[PDB]
Amino acid sequence: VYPVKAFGLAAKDSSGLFSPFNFSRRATGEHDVQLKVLYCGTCQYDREMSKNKFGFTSYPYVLGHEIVGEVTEVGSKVQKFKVGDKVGVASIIETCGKCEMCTNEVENYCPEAGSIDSNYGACSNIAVINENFVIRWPENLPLDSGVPLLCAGITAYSPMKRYGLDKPGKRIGIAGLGGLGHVALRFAKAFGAKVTVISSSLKKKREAFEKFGADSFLVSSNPEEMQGAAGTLDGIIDTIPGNHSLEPLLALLKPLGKLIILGAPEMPFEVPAPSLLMGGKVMAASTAGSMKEIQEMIEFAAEHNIVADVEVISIDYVNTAMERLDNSDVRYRFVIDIGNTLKS
Amino acid sequence: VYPVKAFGLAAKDSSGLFSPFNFSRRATGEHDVQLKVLYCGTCQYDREMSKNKFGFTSYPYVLGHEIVGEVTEVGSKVQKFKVGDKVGVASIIETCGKCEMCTNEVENYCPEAGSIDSNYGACSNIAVINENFVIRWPENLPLDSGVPLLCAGITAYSPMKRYGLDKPGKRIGIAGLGGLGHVALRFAKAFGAKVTVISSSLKKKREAFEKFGADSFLVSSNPEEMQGAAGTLDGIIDTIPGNHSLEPLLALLKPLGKLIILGAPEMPFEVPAPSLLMGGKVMAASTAGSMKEIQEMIEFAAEHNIVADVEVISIDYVNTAMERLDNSDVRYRFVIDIGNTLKS
Ligand SMILES: NC(=O)c1ccc[n+]([C@@H]2O[C@H](COP(=O)([O-])OP(=O)(O)OC[C@H]3O[C@@H](n4cnc5c(N)ncnc54)[C@H](OP(=O)(O)O)[C@@H]3O)[C@@H](O)[C@H]2O)c1
Ligand SMILES: NC(=O)c1ccc[n+]([C@@H]2O[C@H](COP(=O)([O-])OP(=O)(O)OC[C@H]3O[C@@H](n4cnc5c(N)ncnc54)[C@H](OP(=O)(O)O)[C@@H]3O)[C@@H](O)[C@H]2O)c1
Ligand SMILES: [Zn+2]
Ligand SMILES: [Zn+2]
Ligand SMILES: [Zn+2]
Ligand SMILES: [Zn+2]
């Protein structure tokens, strides 16, 4: 219904099959930033959403919730951005502005928070975003390998800060060395933690040590390895997207330790009361992060040279990438090269 | 195997029936406090243990993990306590002293923590306790109505402080208005919270308002009442000992809110990931509390005149009281008058 021509990829139904899709964006309002999309990260969440895993997908579904681009126009009241600036946008682009969560700068938890993909995401030529939901991209962070910071980076960083899993010398587990996990690992290392990777096989063992500097690696299907590490970890970041038990993770925690649940399985977790009571353990979940947190995160990543390991793909490759995500078959995030491959 | 004659009540088997039982206590060592027991609180945990609910009861089981008494002998190196002092003892009376939890003054989480009831509890004439696990009893706290502070009071206070559910103006739910719950409620009120009681029926509604000053009362099995309170609570103290879902409690929490699980059911909790992810909620369990926390708790209770509502009973009534615990049929804790009713 709007004046600015847009084009990208959309799924028509819960098959999740993407196709070229024409749509539109609002004209640039007084407080808006229009940007040419350069790179669009993608991830398991897009695959899950495209197939309506969570039951809340609206079709047609235009993916794209982690973008970097260059400003093409700003509204008359925008001061902070100018034409040509490199900018990033994460998954939340509107909130109520007036509730407790919004006023306390944790607006990602606004009960009326609006996601970028809810009104056509930004695997597209252009995006138009209120200036309060855009960041200036740091000059020392690559655009292609940095874009997943707007999804994986913030999602890890926010709870790591909130729950105190950001201290040197503590022992932090990362469950699932995937898209989100490899970034969480890099943050934990930069905070000075000793990192244990908890993985479903030995395939990523060498990577964990030689790519990531893990201190130890546990295969979750090896009972002796898991048992040997009982009660050793201060915290665990659980990234696993598929059905799994929390009991083995809780067993790895010290008393008072914290399990942070980021992944979103369809099957509910079965949690015996003693698995928490014995040792007074904590389970917390977390989603995304606030704009204040994203700004802190991106400055921290720039200072510590934290980026993702990315496979840069074309628009035409997206359905292949989606199929590869069904076995997490990427090292470690797909990034779509919009600027060079989306046809105009 | 020890020299000092002791006598009290013990259960022989998982019927949970208590009978007179003779046993012994160690002589008073250099750092020990011998005390004559004056009041022994009892509670659902004693009923549960007496019937082996958790599978770890060793018979004979001498109940009594919350006591107030009077010092009768002190060891040669004891300075803090003197003969005749009124003192309190909670459930943990020995720890390893050298692990991370012990050295950080959270020794109730010592993996080798020793409960008072594990080596014959103190529903008995005499107890002998290392001085580091005894507190001086405040003169302005009644012995009879105060003794449950050493079980219910600490169990509520410790996580309320640890997880920040101790701030004025916050909205705190108490699930299950029983032995533990009524004390937790009183602490919440003293911290300046607005309290919502979540209960299994209307039966305790008048008590909640008139006796406890609750701000609202929700029947958990009334969907309209529960739905009307969605997203309103900063935290919940869940005391429920029987099978229940956490989903309705999580739904009452605001984003970032905290559910504290204190009670201990047989059936595991089923927790859908979205029940935590939506709003970034926290579920923490907790057990007992540390000696440092007990001292702070008892000073807070003395300052704010926090006591339990108790029914003082004789030794001869204990089995009848235990039966009444099966339906929580007490307002709100039984306290055994050892000094006046345990026969010499
Ligand atoms: N909370 C938030 O705000 C937020 C934001 C973004 C994404 N997410 C969610 O986070 C989840 C993970 O996303 P991601 O991009 O990291 O996915 P991913 O790239 O597929 O990585 C997940 C990793 O988990 C492990 N794994 C996968 N399926 C498993 C299973 N069934 N059992 C055990 N381990 C399994 C694998 O690690 P190993 O090979 O080491 O075993 C895999 O590499 C998704 O559910 C997504 O929706 C949440
Ligand atoms: N974590 C710790 O360190 C610790 C320490 C002490 C005790 N505990 C545990 O805490 C639990 C509660 O102890 P308590 O002394 O408060 O017991 P209680 O005096 O029997 O009170 C429990 C209350 O929970 C509610 N309730 C009971 N059964 C229920 C069911 N099946 N479904 C729903 N609500 C139910 C009732 O409240 P309404 O009538 O309002 O519905 C009842 O009054 C026990 O499991 C005990 O072992 C734990
Ligand atoms: Zn993403
Ligand atoms: Zn809001
Ligand atoms: Zn008790
Ligand atoms: Zn210890």
Residue numbers in the entry:
A (entry chain B), B (entry chain A): 12 to 355
Source paper text:
Crystal structures of THAS (here referred to as THAS1), a second representative THAS (Cr_021691, THAS2) and the structure of the promiscuous homologue (Cr_032583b, HYS) were solved and mutants revealed key residues that control the stereochemistry of the product profiles. The HYSs perform a single, chemically straightforward reduction reaction that immediately neutralizes the reactivity of strictosidine aglycone/cathenamine. The biological unit is an elongated homodimer, with each subunit divided into a substrate and cofactor-binding domain; the latter also being responsible for forming the dimer interface. The active site cavities of the HYSs are framed by helix α2, the catalytic zinc coordination sphere, and loops 1 and 2, with the NADP(H) co-substrate binding at the base of the active site.
Structures were obtained for THAS1 and THAS2 with NADP+ bound (THAS1, 1.05 Å resolution; THAS2, 2.10 Å resolution) and in apo form (THAS1, 2.25 Å resolution; THAS2, 2.05 Å resolution), while HYS could only be crystallized in the apo form (2.25 Å resolution). In both THAS1 and THAS2, a network of amino acids holds NADP+ in place. Most notably, Glu59 of THAS1 anchors NADP(H) through a bidentate interaction with both ribose hydroxyls, with His59 playing a comparable role in SAD, although here the interaction is with the 3′ OH only. The proximal zinc of THAS1 is ∼2 Å further away from the cofactor relative to SAD and thus may play no direct role in catalysis. However, it may have a function in maintaining the tertiary structure since three of the liganding residues are in the substrate-binding domain and the fourth is in the cofactor-binding domain. SAD/CAD utilize an active site serine that protonates the alkoxide that results from reduction of the aldehyde substrate; this serine is replaced with a tyrosine residue in THAS1 (Tyr56) and HYS (Tyr53). Interestingly, a non-proline cis-peptide is present in the THAS1-NADP+ and HYS apo structures. Closer inspection of this region in THAS1 shows that when this bond is in the trans conformation, the side chain of Asp340 is projected into the cofactor-binding site such that it would prevent NADPH binding. In silico docking with THAS1 positions cathenamine between the nicotinamide of the NADP+ and Tyr56, which is located on helix α2. THAS1 loop 1 contains Phe65 that also projects into the active site and may interact with the aromatic cathenamine substrate.
